[PDB]
Symmetry: C2
Subunit: 211 residues, 2 copies
């Protein structure tokens, strides 16, 4: 959840906002080790419930998100239902555990290519066009992230938007992402320059990947 003024600026200038819980367990092996652990549900539930209690009155918040990159566990199921029960006025989404779990109302993958399937075990990232019509599937698709704008990039962007426009149940996505996370450093002649990972003596680091 963002600094509180953000939602007010969003209400007033007019942007649709996904308000996202402060839960990310990307580093766990497997990604759900904590989110499937009932000992961790209290700590998780606070982070989800307290966002709603704070943010439920902002018109700009149209979708509640259960967190990010934390696999899929019974805790996610539990909190989804809490949100549905507490705030029926908003769909809940979550990318974790396959992007189409019992825990999301929107098929919201990250980096699911337009035409090409990527048949990863357990968590396949289908081609968005194919994903919609998987047997027994009905929900809409909006990529919670797509088109990694890292360095010289965004090549193949027009292909998403052509598909967005043709398929009525494809309803867009959120680009990864807005701003470069470079931090100003200064040199010997007192001159600024943009620095990434490991430029602070920090290690292990994932270098230019913050940008």
């Amino acid at each position: 959840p963002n600094h509180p003024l953000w939602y007010t600026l969003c209400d007033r200038y007019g942007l649709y906002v996904v308000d996202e819980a402060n839960i990310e367990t990307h580093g766990m092996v497997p990604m759900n080790r904590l989110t499937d652990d009932p000992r961790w549900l209290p700590a998780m539930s606070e982070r989800v419930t307290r966002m709603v209690q704070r943010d439920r009155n902002h018109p700009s918040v149209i979708i509640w998100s259960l967190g990010d990159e934390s696999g899929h566990g019974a805790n996610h199921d539990a909190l989804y239902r809490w949100i549905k029960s507490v705030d029926p006025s908003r769909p809940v989404q979550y990318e974790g555990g396959g992007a189409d779990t019992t825990a999301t109302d929107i098929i919201c993958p990250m980096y699911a290519r337009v035409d090409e399937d990527q048949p990863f075990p357990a968590v396949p990232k289908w081609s968005i066009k194919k994903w919609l019509s998987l047997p027994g599937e009905t929900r809409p698709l909006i990529l919670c992230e797509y088109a990694h704008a890292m360095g010289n990039s965004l090549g193949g962007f027009a292909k998403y938007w052509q598909a967005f426009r043709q398929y009525p149940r494809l309803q867009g996505g959120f680009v990864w992402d807005w701003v470069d996370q470079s931090l100003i450093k200064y040199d010997e002649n007192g001159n600024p320059w943009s620095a990434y990972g490991g430029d602070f003596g920090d290690t292990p680091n994932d270098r230019q990947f913050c940008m």
Copy 2:
């Protein structure tokens, strides 16, 4: 309905068959002018009911069809229900009225393209990959007619099969069609040549379209 032997052979040689009532009113304006008329319900009925009575016992008949190019009228609906009621063992498909009406278990377009939409007024021909994912659509897709094999033809046949194989609910189709409907005539030398429409002083005709 075919010569009775056709089914005996399809039983013994192993082919899945679509048995299809003898009803096409293609040339009516609009196409359903009779199939919607309750006074044609008796004559239509017999063509559907007397097929089911004759052919119900053949294992090669896996799907009943209500006819061809006769729009969509209340009679189709009446008769679709009759079969569904008398033979639950086989699904009913019908293409009239935009290929996805209430009188078909199978979305069965004719000449629907893989990727390109043909948004005809009232009866559009969506791309087959798009058709399946349309809001609230659940049914399988199997084109009753595709890849028109007239003359040097069948360009882009590969595009259709990569599609079927990629999309689980794209379950193939029936090519149009098996055999050139040409007839033998004889010249001054008693030598045999292939004739099409027009070649019998028959007029009006649709020329080589019979092939």
